[PDB]
């Protein structure tokens, strides 16, 4: 399908390159040149009319790193907002606009931890599970008991509405992942540590093979976007998976705003609940 919506940078609402737009660049000499050099000649070559059969339309700026747009993904954006001459309204995007966005740096242990430990100090510089603060994830959703659409606190998969008490499964609408925590996770119960067959020494791939959590695999990783962050999983203690985000963004406050379709001015109301 033709991804219509970009940013400046000609990068998708996901935050990765465009298959046409790479193809595009790799007929003619640039697959290799850096981000500057190809939008200078995409701009040459009519900007968002450069693939002829379809029209692009950018809806958003963004802050990129200057690697070669084949190379680009959401972990190199740096900022994001409303393109200035965009006057529609903004889609969904990986990451709330007006916001600067964080990158875990990998970690290297100087001694490997086994277990846990290990895989969680390859995150953050953590000396026990404790030291992880869970994140608070809400949804702007639909209750099917109650009907009100209201902000329900959530994880991946479940959802409860504060009217009445009633769980739901989670569903497509504005999502937050709320103030990011120093050493911050995400912990849900894991299937696969519960079941006695599959247990608490399972595999990575154990883990998605019995989560239900649905991920998206790109070039050997596998991650979740959710309310404004891009997750992926760590590992499990005490039977419940931890999942950080990988990249977060920072409305104001250290809050991660809300993403979804039309939230433009849901994230801007947002903002002026976090001072006084
Ligand atoms: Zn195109
Ligand atoms: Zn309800
Ligand atoms: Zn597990």
Redesign the pocket.
């Known amino acids: 399908a033709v991804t219509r919506y970009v940013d400046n940078n000609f990068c998708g609402p996901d935050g990765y390159p465009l298959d046409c737009i790479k193809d595009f660049l790799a007929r003619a000499g640039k697959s290799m040149c850096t981000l500057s050099e190809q939008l200078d000649y995409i701009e040459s070559k009519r900007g968002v009319y450069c693939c002829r059969d379809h029209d692009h339309e950018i809806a958003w700026f963004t802050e990129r790193s200057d690697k070669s747009y084949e190379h680009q993904t959401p972990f190199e954006i740096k900022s994001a907002k409303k393109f200035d001459t965009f006057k529609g309204e903004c889609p969904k995007f990986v990451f709330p606009l007006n916001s600067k966005v964080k990158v875990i740096q990998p970690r290297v242990e100087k001694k490997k931890t086994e277990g846990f430990m290990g895989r969680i100090r390859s995150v953050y510089p953590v000396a026990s599970p404790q030291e992880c603060n869970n994140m608070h994830l809400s949804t702007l959703m639909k209750?099917?008991?109650?009907?009100?659409v209201?902000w329900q606190t959530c994880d991946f998969l479940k959802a409860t509405?504060?009217?009445?008490?009633?769980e739901?499964l989670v569903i497509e609408g504005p999502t937050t992942c709320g103030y990011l925590p120093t050493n911050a996770v995400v912990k849900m119960p894991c299937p696969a540590c519960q079941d006695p067959e599959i247990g608490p020494e399972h595999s990575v791939a154990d883990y998605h093979n019995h989560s239900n959590i649905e991920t998206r695999l790109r070039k050997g990783g596998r991650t979740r976007c959710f309310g404004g962050c891009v997750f992926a999983y760590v590992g499990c203690y005490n039977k419940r998976a931890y999942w950080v985000p990988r990249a977060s963004a920072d409305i104001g406050s250290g809050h991660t705003g809300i993403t979804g379709d039309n939230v433009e001015t849901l994230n801007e109301d947002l903002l002026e609940i976090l001072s006084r």
Do not use: F, K, V, Y
Not at 143 to 148: A, V
Not at 161 to 166: A, I, L, N, S, V
């Open positions: 209750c099917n008991h109650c009907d009100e209201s509405c504060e009217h009445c008490g009633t739901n």
